[PDB]
Every structure is written in structure tokens, then in C-alpha cells.
Amino acid sequence: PEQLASQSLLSPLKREIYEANCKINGGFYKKDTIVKLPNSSERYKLKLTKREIEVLEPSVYAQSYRIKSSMKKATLLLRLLGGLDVMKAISQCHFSNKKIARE
């Protein structure tokens, strides 16, 4: 199904705890915050590993098709598109001189 990692990998209660923790904490998990569950009087303190922290945050995974090129040729542009915003990277690929940029 088309849904995020937090929605696909967590049980309902753990999802509610995690979402409430992120909401109270500003949008992301923090180690120790007793969270209050809505329409209930019970409180929780979720505990996660850094792998869980990284995997539960929103993200999208894109894969290309079979591209006719070399890794040494792709790296020349993938090292430029390092941590740029996607819109900026799209512009750079639009105005690059390399055949890999279209793909």
C-alpha cells in the first residue's frame, strides 16, 4: 500500500504514541517525554533505537530503470546533487550537459 513508514510498520497504539510524541516535541521524536494519549488518561514513554528513528521519519524512495552508462559517469552528477532541494536538483539536471541528467 501507498503509505508512510510510521503508518506501515507500527501497531496502532505505538503509532498513536509516536505521533503524539512528535506533535508535543515539535514534529520529531525525543528520547524521554511522557506523552498523553487523547480521550484516555494513560501516559506513555516510547523507547526507540536510532535505526527506528531514521526509518520512521517521512521519506520517499525512488529507483531508476536500466540506464546505459557507467557508475563513474553517474557519480560526476550524483556528487553535485548531494543534499540539494529536489526542485533545485531538477533545474540542475535540466540545464546539465550530460546524458544522464535527463534520466
Partner 1 sequence: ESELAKYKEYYQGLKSTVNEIPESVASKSPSLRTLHKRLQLPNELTYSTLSRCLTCPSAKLPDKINNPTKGAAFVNTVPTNKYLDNHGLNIMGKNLLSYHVTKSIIQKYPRLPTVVLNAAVNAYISEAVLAHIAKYWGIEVETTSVLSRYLKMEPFEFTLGRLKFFNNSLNSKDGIELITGKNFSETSALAMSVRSIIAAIWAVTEQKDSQAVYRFIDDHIMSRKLDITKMFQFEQPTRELAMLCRREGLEKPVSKLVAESGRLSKSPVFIVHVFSGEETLGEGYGSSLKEAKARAATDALMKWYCYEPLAQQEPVIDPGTVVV
Partner 2 sequence: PYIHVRCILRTKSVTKRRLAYEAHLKEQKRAPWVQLGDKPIRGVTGGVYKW
* Interacting residues with partner 1 (CB under 8 A): 11, 13-14, 17, 34, 40, 42-48, 52
- To partner 2, the closest distance from the beta carbon of 17 in angstroms equals 17
Taking CB under 7 A as the rule, does residue 82 contact RNA?
yes
- Give the residue from 57, 52, 54, 13 showing the smallest Cα distance to 35: 13
Closest CA relative to residue 3, chosen from 59, 63, 64, 62 = 59
Output 25 or 75, the one with its CB closest to RNA: 75
62 binds RNA (CB under 7 A): no
Cα(73)–Cα(97) distance, rounded to whole angstroms?
Answer: 12
Q: In sequence order, what are the beta bridge partners of 24?
A: none
Question: Which range binds partner 2 by CB under 8 A, 9-17, 35-43, 56-64, 91-99?
Answer: 56-64
3-state DSSP assignment of residue 17 = helix
Question: Does 71 sit near RNA (CB under 7 A)?
Answer: yes
CB 44 within 8 A of CB 35: yes
| Grid coordinates of 22 | 512528535
Stretch that binds partner 2, among 11-19, 28-36, 39-47, 90-98 (CB under 8 A): 28-36
Q: Which residues bind partner 2 (CB under 8 A)?
A: 22, 26-30, 53, 57-71, 74, 78, 86, 100, 103
